Structures are given as structure tokens and as C-alpha cells.
Design an enzyme around this catalytic site. Structure first.
Site, PDB file in Angstrom:
ATOM      1  N   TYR A   1       0.827  -1.201   0.000  1.00 22.68           N
ATOM      2  CA  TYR A   1       0.000   0.000   0.000  1.00 22.68           C
ATOM      3  C   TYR A   1       0.865   1.257   0.000  1.00 22.68           C
ATOM      4  O   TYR A   1       1.794   1.387   0.798  1.00 22.68           O
ATOM      5  CB  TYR A   1      -0.928   0.006   1.217  1.00 22.68           C
TER       6      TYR A   1
ATOM      7  N   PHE B   1       3.166   9.906   2.384  1.00 20.72           N
ATOM      8  CA  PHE B   1       3.362   9.898   3.829  1.00 20.72           C
ATOM      9  C   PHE B   1       3.665   8.488   4.328  1.00 20.72           C
ATOM     10  O   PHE B   1       4.234   8.309   5.406  1.00 20.72           O
ATOM     11  CB  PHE B   1       2.122  10.446   4.536  1.00 20.72           C
ATOM     12  N   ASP B   2       3.280   7.491   3.540  1.00 24.10           N
ATOM     13  CA  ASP B   2       3.510   6.097   3.901  1.00 24.10           C
ATOM     14  C   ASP B   2       3.809   5.258   2.662  1.00 24.10           C
ATOM     15  O   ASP B   2       3.176   5.424   1.620  1.00 24.10           O
ATOM     16  CB  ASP B   2       2.294   5.532   4.635  1.00 24.10           C
TER      17      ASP B   2
ATOM     18  N   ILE C   1      -9.924  -1.833   4.980  1.00 28.47           N
ATOM     19  CA  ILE C   1     -11.157  -1.097   4.731  1.00 28.47           C
ATOM     20  C   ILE C   1     -11.899  -1.658   3.523  1.00 28.47           C
ATOM     21  O   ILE C   1     -11.348  -2.442   2.751  1.00 28.47           O
ATOM     22  CB  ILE C   1     -10.882   0.400   4.500  1.00 28.47           C
TER      23      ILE C   1
ATOM     24  N   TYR D   1      -9.291   7.932   8.134  1.00 27.46           N
ATOM     25  CA  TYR D   1      -8.711   8.122   9.459  1.00 27.46           C
ATOM     26  C   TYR D   1      -9.771   8.578  10.457  1.00 27.46           C
ATOM     27  O   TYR D   1      -9.790   8.137  11.605  1.00 27.46           O
ATOM     28  CB  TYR D   1      -7.577   9.146   9.401  1.00 27.46           C
TER      29      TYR D   1
ATOM     30  N   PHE E   1      -4.475   5.599  -1.420  1.00 33.77           N
ATOM     31  CA  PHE E   1      -3.603   4.454  -1.189  1.00 33.77           C
ATOM     32  C   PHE E   1      -3.466   3.611  -2.454  1.00 33.77           C
ATOM     33  O   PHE E   1      -4.459   3.272  -3.096  1.00 33.77           O
ATOM     34  CB  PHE E   1      -4.146   3.593  -0.046  1.00 33.77           C
TER      35      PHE E   1
END
Length: 117
Positions: free
Chosen positions: A37, A47-48, A67, A93, A110
Site C-alpha cells: 500500500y 506519507f507512507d 477497509i 482516518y 492508497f
């Protein structure tokens, strides 16, 4: 061109867009698979990225550590497949958000990529 930039939305409310078709086998409910992801901010800032940490999200299609968007994409995607899932701050979130990195009222994207099944 004719209408490739379409936007899909499930009963949940989230929206995703197919990136690339998988050149392997499709996932199935109850089967364990490993996917990566790629988080992205509304501006496009990453950010990830588990891919950078070599920490691929491995789970069985039908669990509960993801999700709707993820499950939906897992129940159709195949090995090597690429699907971009976009979820709002209300269905992601939450109104609380994370903290600076992913504040509220901000949509998060994502990128799910099937590595193996």
C-alpha cells in the site's frame, strides 16, 4: 480519451481507480496474499510506503485489518495488479485524523499492488 478517466464508488462511499491489470491469478475470499500500500496526501505527498520499508501488507481476503476499498480491490485484483483506492477523511482516518501528516477534512489515497497470492 473516450472515457477512461472514470470514477467508481461503492455502497460505502469510497472511490478507486484501476491502475494496471494483473498478469497472474486473482485473489479469493479466504486466501492469503501479500500486497503493498502506497499512502498519498491530497497534494500527492507520500506519507507512507511499505515498499520502502519492505513491509508488504500480507493478509487473507475477508479479514478485518483493512477497509472496504481494500477488500473490494482484493476480491478482484490479481498478482502484479495495481489499483488506487481513494478514501475520504470521514471513511478513512476519521474526524480526528492522525496528526499533521494526515489531518482531518483531508482525503487520503492508497496504492494497492498485488505482490503474490
Amino acid at each position: 480519451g473516450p472515457g477512461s478517466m472514470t470514477v467508481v464508488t461503492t455502497e460505502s462511499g469510497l472511490k478507486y481507480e484501476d491502475l494496471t491489470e494483473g498478469s497472474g491469478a486473482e485473489a479469493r475470499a479466504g486466501q492469503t496474499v501479500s500486497v503493498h500500500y502506497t499512502g498519498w496526501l491530497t497534494d500527492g505527498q507520500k506519507f507512507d510506503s511499505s515498499k520502502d520499508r519492505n513491509d508488504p501488507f500480507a493478509f487473507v481476503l475477508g479479514g478485518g485489518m483493512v477497509i472496504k476499498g481494500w477488500d473490494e480491490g482484493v476480491q478482484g485484483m490479481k498478482v502484479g495488479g495495481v489499483r488506487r483506492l481513494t478514501i475520504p477523511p470521514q471513511l478513512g482516518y476519521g474526524a480526528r485524523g492522525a496528526g499533521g501528516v494526515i489531518p482531518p477534512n483531508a482525503t487520503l489515497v492508497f496504492e494497492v499492488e498485488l505482490l503474490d497470492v
